[PDB]
Structure formats: C-alpha cells, structure tokens
Amino acid sequence: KPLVGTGMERAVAVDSGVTAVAKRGGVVQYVDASRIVIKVNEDEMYPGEAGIDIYNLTKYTRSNQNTCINQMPCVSLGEPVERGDVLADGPSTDLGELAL
C-alpha cells in the first residue's frame, strides 16, 4: 500500500474487477488460496436457497501485457464479512487498496 495516498485507492481497486468483493455479507466458512466460501447471513438470504457464496480466485494467469494476474484472499477463516467487502486482492492491490 502507499504510505502516502489520496484516498482514491479503494475506489480504484474495487471498481476494477481485479478483487473479489463480497456480494452478500456473511461469515467466511472456508478460505483457501484458490477459493473463498461465505456462509451468507440469514438477513441477506432469499427463501429457498443454500445461502452460500463461492468465490473462485484467479491464480497466475497472464494479462495482455504478459504480467501475472493472481488473486490472494484477504479474509481469514471464520471472519465476518459485510456486503461490498474485499475478500481477495487482485494484482497490485493490498487489502482492497490499490498498491502500484
């Protein structure tokens, strides 16, 4: 992360699709270098639904520039997440902040 930023870093990192952002809030049920499994809160569940969000992370693929696109989970196991929280960092993001 930048020690001196401007505050647009979170906006840039989230509004690009490089991160995995929580669609619904919940609890991290299973985190792993290649996937995050969120048990959605009962408040955000639709009726007739498992209530489980699965985020499959992009691992070591090449960009148009032959750089590496790799997603790493920010969350730990059992950690509560809210909607819109960054769950995995993309290339050049650090905890959801753009880190160039």
Next chain:
Amino acid sequence: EIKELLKLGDLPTSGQIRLYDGRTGEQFERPVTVGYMYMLKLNHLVDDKM
C-alpha cells in the same frame, strides 16, 4: 500538519537528517532529505529492450 506529524513520531520537522557515508563513515556535510517515496517499476524492463 506534516511537521506536526513528524513531531509526533519524534523526527526532525525539517525532514532532513544527518547521514553518513557507508564507504568512509564520515558525515555528508549537510542534512539530507530522507523519507519514504512510493516507487513504481514500469514495464520498460531492460530484458525486453536489450
């Protein structure tokens, strides 16, 4: 505000400290601006150019 935050971290509010030469051990004769800048590695790598 930068100088107030330098003061809070017990640093000179001038931003400039006394540096020593690694090769001779003697002071550079003036205080030097030392700090932290955010550096970026651009995609103009010399492996691709040579």
Next chain:
Amino acid sequence: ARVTVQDAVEKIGNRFDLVLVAARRARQMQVGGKDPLVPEENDKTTVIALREIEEGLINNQILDVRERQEQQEQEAAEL
C-alpha cells in the same frame, strides 16, 4: 593502448590521410607478413600502425619506398 590520436595527426598532417596510411600499414601487419616496427604491447594492428605513425617510422612516403623496394627486389630475384 590509444586514447587520443592527435600526436599521429601532427606527423601526417591530415586526419583523413592518417586513416588511409594507418589502414594500409595495419593491413600490411594483419594479412601481410610484416612485423611491427614498434614493440607490440598487446595492441591491435590499427593501434600498432598509429603508434608507428606517431614515431615517424611510417608515413605514405615510407610505405611507398618500402613497397617499391620489395617489388623491385622480388621481381629481380628470379632467373
């Protein structure tokens, strides 16, 4: 070695003529069987030729009389 070529330009008064004389002498040393007139201190034939030119041992007139001497000598040395 050779850093500055200025001392050879004074002898052969041109920089353009110097290149020609020095390349003639350097080719004599490189592909001809000619040995340097100066101690070859791990130099290439271009630098040896320049060091001979800067000592007055080689110029266009010296190269000319040397080739005429060799030519008349070897055209005369057969029956």
Next chain:
Amino acid sequence: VTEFLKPRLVDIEQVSSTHAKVTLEPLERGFGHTLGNALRRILLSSMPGCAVTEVEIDGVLHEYSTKEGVQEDILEILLNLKGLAVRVQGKDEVILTLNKSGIGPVTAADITHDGDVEIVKPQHVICHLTDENASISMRIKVQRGRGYVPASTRIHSEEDERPIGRLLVDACYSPVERIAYNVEAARVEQRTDLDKLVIEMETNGTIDPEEAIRRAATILAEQLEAFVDLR
C-alpha cells in the same frame, strides 16, 4: 607516542534475542571511527549464516501453484521460509522436515526436531492450514553460506536437480540486519583523549554478538596481511 593503547571487548549488553551492544575500549584518538566503519562494513557484508535454499513440498511441482487447504500460494510459503532463522551446529547443510495437519498456523515450531539445529523464532508463521483434512509435508534444505546468493546463480550450476518439484529459494545468508556504532569518550584513569566504541547490532538471532565481532576482526586482520608484508 609510538605505542597505542589497544581496545578490548569490555561489555556485551544483550538488549534482546536479536539486538546487542558491544563495547570496545579503550580506543586512541581517531581509531574509534576507523575500527567502527571497518567493523561495520565487514559485519554487514561478510558474516556467515544458514539460510533455506531448497524446499520440497510434497505435492507441488512449481511455486506458481496452490495447495488445497493451505491459505497461501506456494510462492508465499517460500517467501515465508526465506525468512526462517536457523542456527546449525556442526554441519554446513541440514534437511529439516515439516509435517503438519489440521486447521491452524504452521509455524517454525512445527519443524521436526533435529539435534544439531536450533530455530530461534519458533513463532515464525510458514503457512495456514484452513481445512481439517488438509496436511502439509515439506523437506527444507538449510545451508550455511555467506552473503546473498540468488537462485538464478544456482539453477544451472548442475546440482543434479532431476526432481521437478524441488523449489529453490534465494538465500540471504547474512545474519546481521543492522549495525550502528557510536564513539563516546572513555573514563580511563589518567587520559582524556581515549574513546570507546559501542556497536549496536541487530541480527536474526542466529549469531553470537561477540562471535561476530571476533569474526569481523579476524577478517580485517587477514586482509591486512598483504599490506603488512607488501611485497
């Protein structure tokens, strides 16, 4: 005038496991900085230490991959093992083994106990297992050396590396993290122009401070023989 007072190692103030303060006393005028910078430049570049140089994780072929049940990529595990601080007694190469199952952090305290190997920070996290049926098993090759040897220097030096799946780690062997030195005035009986030299020394915990001062002074004295003789 022609005879100098020679320093002696007076005091070692071990502030921490990884931070020490060595005092050299008494020093003549000007020798505090001479010895200080020579010893700093040698302590900072020339000290020997053990570094992880190779890892074989059981199921992995390259570091750009993920193990199932482990929260970190293999590349991040190798970066965590690069900073593993080991002191090996009586060898110049050892192979440690780490087997660990179940949910929790895999730390350096989980490396199996070798007799001639000491882990100085056992709380050093290597990875996290996030699955109860997950398990990790690796063979970590610790090696003694000097300086910084990247793996790029070490790939095609033959090394009989037929196994795909043996991952090379860049080896930073120097145990010394930071050297500072300060030349204070000494309190000797008669004289007032005598100095003392305090060397503040941050290490990774895997070298004794007095041993490192002895070693740096030995390196100086062996480099000075070419000038003492000067033929």
Next chain:
Amino acid sequence: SVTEFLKPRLVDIEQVSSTHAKVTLEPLERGFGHTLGNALRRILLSSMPGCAVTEVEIDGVLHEYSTKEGVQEDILEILLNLKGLAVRVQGKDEVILTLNKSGIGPVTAADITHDGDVEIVKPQHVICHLTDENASISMRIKVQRGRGYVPASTRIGRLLVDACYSPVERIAYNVEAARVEQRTDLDKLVIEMETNGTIDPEEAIRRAATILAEQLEAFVDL
C-alpha cells in the same frame, strides 16, 4: 568455505619518485577496497607517528606578522618553509636545532647545526633568503615527536608552526572493478601515496597496516 576470503595476488608497486608510489592490490573481495583503503588512508593521515617542527624562535621577531630586515620572505613564509622541513630524530622525543647564518644567498636546511640524534632528510630545503650581506638569520627550531597533524590554532617570543608529525604528504585510494574467472564484482585497490622523505611510501603503508592489525589483536582468532 565461509571463512575463507579472496586475498590479493597481484601487488603492483609503481614508484613514481623516491617518495611517491602507487600500490595496487587485486583482487579484493567486494567492498574490501573501500574498507582497507579508508582504514589505511585514515591511519596514515591521522595516527602515523613522526617528528615535526612545532615552534621556532627567531631573534628579531616577536610575532608572526612582524618582519625582519635582510631576509627576503616575511616570517609567515619562513614558518611555511620550516613546516615542510622533514626531520628524523633517532633517540629523543624533543630536540632544539639551532640555525645561524649570515651573508647573501639561500639559508638551506644544510645550514642547520648538526646534532647527533637528528637527521635532515632534504638538506637543500630552502628556509629563507638573506639579501644584503650584513643581515644574519638565527633561530631555535623545536623538533618534537607526535602523530598526525596538529595545527597551531589548537595549541595557543616563540612562533608556533603547524606540526606535520606524520610522514605522509598525500594518501589517495581508488577502488576499481576486478574480475576473477566467473567472479566479476571484485575490487581492485589503487593506493597513490606520497611521503615527506623520512620513510618511503611502502614502509609507511606497512606501518599503517601494522598499527591497525595490532589494534585488532584482542579479537583475532589466531
């Protein structure tokens, strides 16, 4: 192994003068050019012992900005000429040379009254010039043993001279690249040294290295 270091194999001493040499050590382990060069430069500059003119007392002179009749230079340049006077004292730590001269011509170091314990390195060293055949220059030159350079501003009839105790007149070092057969980042240390003539430059380098290696004797694992 990890305790064995690259020690120099090519020691090239180029003697530019009787008192000016260029020593070259190659190869050194990377970074040891600056370590060894700066340690030796610093000892040669500040800690080398020797003898030097510390003060002189001239008859008609009471302070440095006075003048003497018959001598060409002022007393400032007489003190400057005595500052560069090289001297070797064998048995004592303090001697007082006496210089009496009258007439016309240079008052060289050969005119200094010969003491047994004292040796003048350069007897053709000009101290002053007498100009009118009636003036006499007579002075008492205090030669004292010390180490390094000790200026007179730190030490304040007699006129203090900056005491150039150490025999080194110039010490410079230069670290360039050296390569050994698939090792390419090594050092090569070139030491350009000039002494004042009391000792030759290679002996002064050996003496500085001996001073440092004797400082280190309490920590070296013999």
Next chain:
Amino acid sequence: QDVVLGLYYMTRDCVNAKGEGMVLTGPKEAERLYRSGLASLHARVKVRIT
C-alpha cells in the same frame, strides 16, 4: 548537473569556516586537512601555489 554542483560547492567560501586563516604549504596540505577533518572545504586560507 552533479559535476558543476560539486565543483561549485568545493570552490565556495564560508566566512568563519573551520580552519580559517591558516597558511598551507600547498594543495596537498589542503587535502590532508580536509580529509582529516581539521579544515573546511570553504575555509578561506593562504596556500603556497606554484
């Protein structure tokens, strides 16, 4: 750039710089005094120059 700044800083004079007003036997003495820390680079001084 760097060369003219170093040569300018070297050839400038301070008023009360350390070692002001001494008399030097030559440029080698000036270098000895600067390197041993006894005179400042800007000390206005009197040097015997040939």
Next chain:
Amino acid sequence: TPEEKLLRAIFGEKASDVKDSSLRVPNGVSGTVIDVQVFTRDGVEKDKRA
C-alpha cells in the same frame, strides 16, 4: 554438395528425412513451465499428453 556427399560416404551417416522444427525457449528467457494446453483437430489422434 559433392564434398558433404563424400563426407557421408566416408562415415556412412544417413541424412535425416525430417528437420528439427521444435519450439524452444527464447534466448535469455529462463522460466518455469506452469501450464501446457494441447488443442488437437478432429480426426487427428490425441497423443498420451493430450
């Protein structure tokens, strides 16, 4: 060529009916193979790797 024809008459080495057209790592590039994809046409038989 007649000279290499004699060369192969002396040492009896047959000439290759195929030329090496392999895919090589570009020079200066040193990496790790992390993925291999084989796309085979319909009617072509997949090798053991595919």
Next chain:
Amino acid sequence: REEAVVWDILDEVIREHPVLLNRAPTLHRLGIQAFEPVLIEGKAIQLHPLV
C-alpha cells in the same frame, strides 16, 4: 554453450576495437560517437556522463 574460454576470446577481440554508439534523433554528428568497449555484466549500456 558460452564456455569459459569464449569470454577470454571476447575480451581479446573487443580490446582495441571501437564501437559506434548512436542515439536517435541524430540531430548532428555528435549523435554518433565511437568508444572503446568495457565489458560489463548488465544489459544496459553504460554511457560516460560528459558525452
């Protein structure tokens, strides 16, 4: 194979052999100058500051 002897051969073939260094745009003739090469270990050409 880059045997150890081809580096000695290379150090003696470049010895007195200049190379021309050119920066575009070559606005005047000092945009091409000849230099004696010193073999370095990087991938970048080391230019003298004064030129």
